[PDB]
């Protein structure tokens, strides 16, 4: 027949060690994403605080109990 | 008989030799019953687990009430010398010799193993009495040989084709070592070998065409040395299980502490570990330690002791840190 003669796709000789096929599962590993999954509702709060750290004192004081309504009218605490 | 040593969790070539012997005994076609003392010297070292604390306990259970022969090294030269002693042991010895000649292929190995599980080994005694139509002796699982053969059966179905090839490449290496030995010259021709070999070689189903090229597969792989050999990874000269190594080491240290043994062969073989089996077998370190004290070497004693107590503590779940200091 004719199997190894075609070179139109990733074959056994393109990767360096042909014996790497033994593992062949590390590709199917979802590496954990940066920030919130380190907490594993608390993750978003932790992430919120982590980004919330970047304020000036008065600026943070403005947004302590900040709430914005849909129509655009503003409530300040 | 020397060579590199490596621990194997698979069927060692030594293991098949017992399987060779048990096949002849159970077949009862040749009327050859291997003496019980032979089995008890061969299988018993393979029986698992003895344990031996470094110090703080001396031969509290290791000493056998009856003096036992030393365990046998996995070389055809040593194995044959056990059967050879008897006046009729030649007949038993040739039985082993012929079977090793008949087994020329991996398939033939499988024929032996399929034969035993289907016919010889049987789950329990209650089916002994219903199987009076069997022309071969049948084995119970709980028996001395039965429990061993069960383990051997397990170690064959446990691996892929990768392990089976290693069995045959090593056995042919193992068989050929005995070939360039003076004793093999003494047994160059024995006519009985051909008789026993032809007993099992029969029913080959082909003798004219395949056998012409069956030899070609065998010979081409083998080191005919006519051309450059096919290049293959370095293979170990001897394969032993962990439990078999436990028996030979324990006997050696006990013999050292206070039927002939082969100190040189055991010591030389123990010096070729891949350093990973040493982790799997921490007792190799202390074997140097007992040797170290004999010549009164201070630092060489110490590191070995520290070596032994680092691998042992991790392997065993119970806390032995309180034992290391003592």
């Amino acid at each position: 027949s004719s199997s190894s003669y075609r070179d139109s796709y990733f074959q056994y000789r393109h990767l360096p060690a042909p014996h790497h096929i033994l593992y062949a599962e590390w590709n199917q590993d979802i590496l954990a994403l940066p920030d919130e999954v380190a907490n594993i509702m608390t993750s978003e709060q932790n992430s919120n605080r982590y980004w919330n750290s970047f304020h000036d004192e008065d600026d943070w004081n403005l947004f302590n109990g900040m709430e914005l309504e849909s129509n655009g009218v503003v409530t300040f605490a | 008989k020397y060579g590199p040593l490596g621990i194997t969790n698979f069927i060692t070539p030594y293991d098949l030799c017992i399987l060779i012997l048990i096949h002849a005994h159970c077949s009862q076609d040749n009327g050859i019953s291997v003496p019980t003392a032979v089995f008890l010297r061969l299988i018993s070292p393979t029986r698992p687990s003895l344990e031996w604390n470094p110090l703080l306990k001396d031969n509290s259970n290791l000493r056998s009430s009856s003096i036992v022969p030393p365990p046998v090294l996995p070389i055809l030269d040593n194995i044959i010398r056990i059967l050879l002693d008897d006046k009729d042991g030649n007949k038993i010895a040739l039985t082993l010799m012929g079977y090793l000649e008949a087994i020329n292929g991996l398939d033939s190995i499988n024929r032996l193993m399929m034969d035993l599980e289907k016919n010889c080994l049987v789950n329990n005694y209650r089916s002994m009495k219903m199987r009076t139509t069997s022309t071969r002796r049948q084995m119970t699982r709980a028996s001395f040989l039965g429990t061993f053969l069960s383990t051997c059966i397990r170690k064959y179905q446990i691996g892929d084709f990768e392990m089976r090839e290693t069995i045959w490449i090593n056995l042919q290496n193992f068989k050929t070592v005995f070939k360039h030995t003076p004793l093999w010259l003494r047994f160059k021709d024995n006519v009985h070998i051909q008789k026993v070999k032809n007993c099992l070689l029969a029913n080959d189903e082909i003798s004219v065409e395949d056998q012409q090229m069956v030899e070609f597969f065998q010979h081409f792989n083998n080191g005919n040395d006519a051309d450059s050999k096919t290049m293959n990874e370095e293979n170990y000269g001897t394969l032993i299980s962990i439990q078999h190594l436990q028996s030979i080491v324990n006997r050696q240290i006990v013999n050292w502490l206070d039927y002939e043994e082969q100190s040189g062969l055991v010591f030389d073989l123990l010096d070729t570990l891949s350093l990973n089996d040493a982790t799997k077998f921490p007792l190799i370190f202390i074997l140097k330690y007992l040797e170290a004290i004999k010549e009164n070497s201070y630092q060489t004693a110490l590191d070995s002791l520290h070596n032994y107590f680092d691998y042992k503590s991790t392997g065993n779940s119970q806390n032995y840190f309180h034992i290391s200091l003592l």
């Binding site: - | 969790n9 698992p48 397990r154 446990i158 299980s241 799997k280």
Partner: protein, 48 residues
């Protein structure tokens, strides 16, 4: 001391049916919206 041979013996014993027990559950052919896990449960009720 964990015997390495017994450990790998159980590991082989666990994986061997795993190939056989593959087609269970999630896998569904097309044209049959109902996986084979309940093909035998209905088959069990058929005779029983």
């Amino acid at each position: 001391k964990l015997d390495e041979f017994l450990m790998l013996s159980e590991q082989y014993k666990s994986r061997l049916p795993k190939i056989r027990k593959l087609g269970w559950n999630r896998f569904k052919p097309i044209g049959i919206n109902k996986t084979m896990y309940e093909l035998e449960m209905l088959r069990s009720r058929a005779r029983a």
